[PDB]
Design a protein around this ligand. Structure first.
Ligand code: HEM
Ligand code: HEM
Ligand SMILES: Cc1cc(N)nc(C[C@H]2CNC[C@H]2OCCCCCc2cccc(F)c2)c1
Ligand SMILES: Cc1cc(N)nc(C[C@H]2CNC[C@H]2OCCCCCc2cccc(F)c2)c1
Ligand SMILES: C[C@H](O)[C@H](O)[C@H]1CNc2nc(N)[nH]c(=O)c2N1
Ligand SMILES: C[C@H](O)[C@H](O)[C@H]1CNc2nc(N)[nH]c(=O)c2N1
Ligand SMILES: [Zn+2]
Lengths: 407, 411
């Protein structure tokens, strides 16, 4: 019932107790492990509320104080009456920060407590959403000195009146059908680019066209807005050694900002809660550039390096992959946009695991996502046993809204 | 019930029914996933069910389920168990058994090859000397002057747990490590403890960076005995680089035959605690793990110094760069000497093909992602994007505790 995790590199052994407060389910059973699958009202609300406020009041050293008991009654009175309730600012800040703290797939969690929270619960329209978002993007960007932040739109009610950002990130490039049978821009975004075009966007049809935000307020049809160009910090990609690199025409954006998830605090669901921090290099260099189903550029790069592409065993793919990632890091650093490499990121996450075992009794971690998609075994996370379990407050996936919302 | 797995690169969707024949337990629950934890006498009562299950499986595969010959064999095993408490496998069953343990190893990327496996039956073996002889022949047959052949040698099964056959070496061929009084290590730091025990048992250590350890063998529950593999049986490749001429002066070499000797093979409820098997390397097992783990040979600094990489900031990606050149070197060297080896691109691609055929023909393929995906270049290999189900079938290879931890010394 107490569980040991060992690090096979350093022999350090940790004891996890935090898992016993695990609440949600994993997908695994004693018969079958699903570790590698990408996705495995009135009655229920008060339990969820209570469990949250309990951890809250414990966290501020007020467990069992009168202020504690009073809030618990206040919230119960509100639910019995209004079939829902509202969070205090202090509660909301703590909930958001803890959803980040509990994100088992996030390597960057040493930072969890430095999160600027923007309370946008007073928002009512899609134009209001847009204003909030622009302010978030500008505050977060900070002329290259990136700062973590999240913006929280009003919470779900009867699920007939959801707030949703339709984009998956705030900033993403378009992807287009061609007669060629090929793909122009980012293939990740084809379908969404077409929901744009069909809702009205005039697509410039380039390789790196910044997508229009698509915002939905109080369950209404969504509306299109272009983030001001001057707010979208982008980075031209060059290599510190190869002068030809820049002729590939590569650029990436500086701000990673996931916008499609759902934040759950104390039973309440926040369906629009865009959040953002800063990139680990490999997310752009390995995934964005080199995945077959993305910009898929290895072939073009290797050629320019004049490597022997005759046999997989010359490791030309691997050689080209390292250079691309060297070019990503170098470009962001030279333009002074914040970025972290995988060595530094993982080394920080291991220090953060230790702190969290020391100070909280554990740290939920999904090894499959924490280990970088290149050079796994030379980073320390590789040798570290991890335990994966679901705690609340949390971020969760939710179905794409187009499939769902009635048009 | 049906479980679906998706490939995120190709959109290929597969259906597993095979997980429905799973018995042993994973270590995971509905509340905790242990998918990244490394290490998560049988009475008569359980033995016949286990025998029966195996024998039903065996008899299905040869298309004689329900035959008279199937019925009679269940009867005969039945009797042998009630009378002697154990039973003996036919050759045919043992071979089928050992092939399936491989086929069921979910941590093994090499399984496309599972049906081509040479089985050496060493169950007449009675002494340690006898064990030497069997193992030398395995190594010679498997080696084949560089054209590697997969093989397994199976020594007599567990009886009362007091008369166990064990190979104390974790692999038949591995290098000694020595811990120095200054605190540093010479040779392979991984084998320090085992090296210590061999010294204790009378081995005269050369004390080099690449001394082939002696075999240390336990027959019939007796104290283990030392033996040196004939050096002419031990194929080695010195490592050099196609473009970097200073690479050879690093002094690196490795052996050709990877041969796991510390696992326990389970078939029909019987336990074969000495069952060393061997195939051929994927390059990254040497070039990533053996050379570049901090806990192993750890040659990253020296390699990148010599390549003159900027080493003052991890963000130059100098480690990633040195790591690639070493791996190019390992593969170049094995190929030049004509010693069988597979690169990680080719190995994962074959695997995905095997995995698909297995779902089409067998209704599944248990697979552990943490292990299947290579420890360099993860996402440019097709397994990264592959969803996988992990569960346990028998026959199977299992871990067993190191024998110096359990052995009762006779003196
Ligand atoms: C400060 C710098 C940050 C770094 C370096 C970082 C790093 C990462 C990385 C590399 C991933 C995997 C991405 C992928 O391969 O798709 C990830 C996932 C995630 N991170 Fe972060 N993160 C940062 C900030 C944040 C913030 C501010 C939040 C929320 C407040 C957050 C919450 C999450 C969540 C929920 C996921 C996984 C979502 C899922 O299940 O798909 N992270 N993080
Ligand atoms: C044909 C050449 C083969 C290749 C290229 C290959 C590949 C691999 C690799 C790379 C590993 C993981 C090693 C590591 O990363 O630490 C592995 C694990 C394993 N393989 Fe193979 N394999 C081969 C043949 C075999 C054979 C002949 C057997 C036995 C019949 C076998 C059974 C296993 C088992 C049981 C494991 C799990 C090890 C553990 O849990 O510690 N493989 N395979
Ligand atoms: C906040 C943050 C910081 C940071 N450095 N990185 C991230 C992750 C971002 C950057 N790159 C990918 C994005 O993560 C999203 C992962 C979700 C993919 C899973 C998915 C969701 C929905 C539909 C799918 F088909 C597949 C987030
Ligand atoms: C048959 C075979 C073929 C092939 N290509 N690879 C393998 C796996 C081998 C090759 N490299 C390591 C080994 O896998 C097991 C690794 C376990 C870690 C070392 C260890 C294991 C057990 C006890 C120890 F003290 C130390 C096996
Ligand atoms: C803790 C973690 O599971 C452990 O380090 C695993 C990770 N994946 C691995 N994968 C392979 N192929 N071999 C290994 O030794 C390991 N080690
Ligand atoms: C199928 C498998 O779960 C999938 O490829 C995962 C593997 N690990 C990952 N790790 C990260 N960080 N991001 C991902 O999108 C994935 N994809
Ligand atoms: Zn699991």
């Amino acid at each position: 019932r107490f569980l040991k995790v060992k690090n096979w590199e350093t022999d350090v052994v940790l004891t996890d107790t935090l898992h016993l407060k695990s609440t949600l389910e994993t997908g695994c059973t004693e018969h079958i492990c699903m570790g590698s699958i990408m996705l495995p009202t009135k009655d229920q609300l008060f339990p969820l509320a209570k469990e949250f406020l309990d951890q809250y009041y414990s966290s501020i050293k007020r467990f069992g104080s009168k202020a504690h008991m009073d809030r618990l009654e206040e919230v119960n009175k509100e639910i019995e009456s209004t079939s829902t309730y509202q969070l205090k600012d202090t509660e909301l800040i703590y909930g958001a920060k803890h959803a980040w703290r509990n994100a088992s797939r996030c390597v960057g969690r040493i930072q969890w407590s430095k999160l600027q929270v923007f309370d946008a619960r007073d928002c009512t329209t899609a134009h209001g959403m847009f204003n909030y978002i622009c302010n978030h993007v500008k505050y977060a960007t900070n002329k290259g000195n990136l700062r973590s932040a999240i913006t929280i739109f009003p919470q779900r009610t009867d699920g007939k009146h959801d707030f949703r950002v339709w984009n998956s990130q705030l900033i993403r490039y378009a992807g287009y059908k061609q007669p060629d049978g090929s793909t122009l821009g980012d293939p990740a975004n084809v379908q969404f680019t077409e929901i744009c075009i069909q809702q009205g966007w005039k697509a410039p049809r380039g390789r790196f066209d910044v997508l229009p935000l698509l915002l939905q307020a109080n369950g209404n049809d969504p509306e299109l807005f272009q983030i001001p160009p001057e707010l979208v910090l982008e980075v031209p990609i060059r290599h510190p050694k190869f002068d030809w690199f820049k002729d590939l025409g590569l650029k990436w954006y500086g701000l990673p900002a996931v916008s499609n998830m759902l934040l759950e605090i104390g039973g309440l669901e926040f369906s629009a809660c865009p959040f953002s921090g800063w990139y680990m290099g490999t997310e752009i260099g390995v995934r964005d550039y080199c995945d077959n189903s993305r910009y898929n550029i290895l072939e073009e790069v290797a050629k320019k390096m004049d490597l022997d592409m005759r046999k997989t065993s010359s490791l030309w793919k691997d050689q080209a992959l390292v250079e691309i990632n060297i070019a990503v890091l170098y470009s962001f650093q030279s333009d002074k946009v914040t970025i972290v490499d995988h060595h530094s990121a993982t080394e920080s996450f291991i220090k953060h695991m230790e702190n969290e075992y020391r100070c909280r009794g554990g740290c939920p971690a999904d090894w499959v996502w924490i280990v970088p998609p290149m050079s796994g075994s030379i980073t320390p996370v590789f040798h570290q046993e991890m335990l994966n379990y679901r705690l609340t407050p949390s971020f969760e996936y939710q179905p794409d809204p187009w499939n769902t919302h009635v048009w």
